[PDB]
Ligand binder design. Structure first.
Ligand code: NAG
Ligand code: FE
Ligand code: FE
Ligand code: NA
Ligand code: OH
Length: 301
């Protein structure tokens, strides 16, 4: 069966004090390496918060080696490409530096704040589009507000331009599977909860244009949510931290939550996505190696 395989990991960005990683980040690096070795991966998606707590200063920042390259260094992961987007902490520093780092590290691919990826499932005519968004420039930086919510964008032109781009791209996308990814959640039951900006501006487009799933991090846990139209919400924000909060449980429409794992003494985890001509599958994997939940999502008509 033709297949495209990828890991989606969020909020993995270590720490700025020595040794520049956490035990959770290392456990996820090892667990991801084991998953790649045993099941395979064509690429890894980062769902943002790549360098805690204030990003990187420029493209030569030692954190690229300390928190990224040296951490994800097990043999099975050498040469697996990453496709990256930014979170709020990245935007407290220099995101242009993370984009420029694409020219330094072969496996790091981050061409602009938001961009389109297209894949053909090998030995099939089935196609996949992934739209990588910058939810910080769209909605604001949550760290700019005492509320730790993205109350408004810093720059109106950047936000309006990205929204227009999303709309145009989603209206034109002909692919068999269409995924959208961004740092902040549409829906989440946890410490930050739903992002009002995305519920208002992005979700109507995901629905109208029959997107398969929206992938995100930002809340430091694992969740699968699904609305009554079958649109999936893959929340994978557990590469470095585990927050057991259910603070926003009642702010998500009843029944949307299908799976949640946030145990405070867990090492975290990630999502593993498999796309075939038959369906898309998502498996949530704890950093201890345990498979926690698996679900499938359909092809677009
Ligand atoms: C951000 O990083 C880029 C790439 O290294 C650099 O050219 C630019 O000067 C940096 N910006 C600031 C404000 O440091
Ligand atoms: Fe985070
Ligand atoms: Fe975040
Ligand atoms: Na390995
Ligand atoms: O986050």
């Amino acid at each position: 069966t033709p297949i495209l395989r990828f890991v989606a990991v969020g909020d993995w960005g270590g720490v700025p004090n020595a040794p520049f990683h956490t035990a959770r980040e290392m456990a996820n690096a090892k667990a991801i390496a084991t998953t790649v070795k045993t099941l395979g991966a064509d690429f890894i998606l980062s769902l943002g918060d790549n360098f805690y707590f204030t990003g990187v200063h420029d493209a030569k920042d030692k954190r690229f080696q300390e928190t990224f390259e040296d951490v994800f260094s097990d043999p099975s992961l050498r040469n697996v490409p990453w496709h990256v987007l930014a979170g709020n902490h990245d935007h407290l520093g220099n995101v242009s530096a993370q984009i420029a780092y694409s020219k330094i590290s072969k496996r790091w691919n981050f061409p602009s704040p938001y961009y389109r990826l297209r894949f053909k499932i090998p030995r099939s005519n089935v196609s996949v589009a992934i739209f990588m968004l910058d939810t910080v420039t769209l909605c604001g930086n949550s760290d700019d507000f005492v509320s730790q919510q993205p109350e408004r964008p810093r720059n109106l032109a950047l936000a309006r331009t990205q929204l227009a781009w999303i709309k145009k791209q989603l209206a034109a996308a002909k692919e068999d599977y269409v995924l959208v990814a961004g740092h902040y959640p549409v829906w989440s039951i946890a410490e930050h909860g739903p992002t009002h900006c995305l519920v208002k501006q992005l979700l109507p487009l995901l629905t109208t244009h029959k997107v398969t799933a929206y992938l995100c991090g930002h809340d430091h846990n694992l969740q699968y949510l699904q609305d009554e139209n079958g649109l999936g919400f893959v929340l994978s924000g557990a590469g470095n931290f585990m927050d057991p909060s259910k603070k926003h449980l009642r702010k998500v429409p009843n029944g949307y939550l299908r799976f949640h794992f946030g145990a405070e003494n867990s090492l975290g985890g990630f999502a593993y996505v498999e796309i075939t001509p038959k369906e898309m599958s998502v498996t949530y994997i704890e950093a201890s190696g345990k498979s926690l939940f698996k679900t499938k999502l359909p092809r677009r008509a």
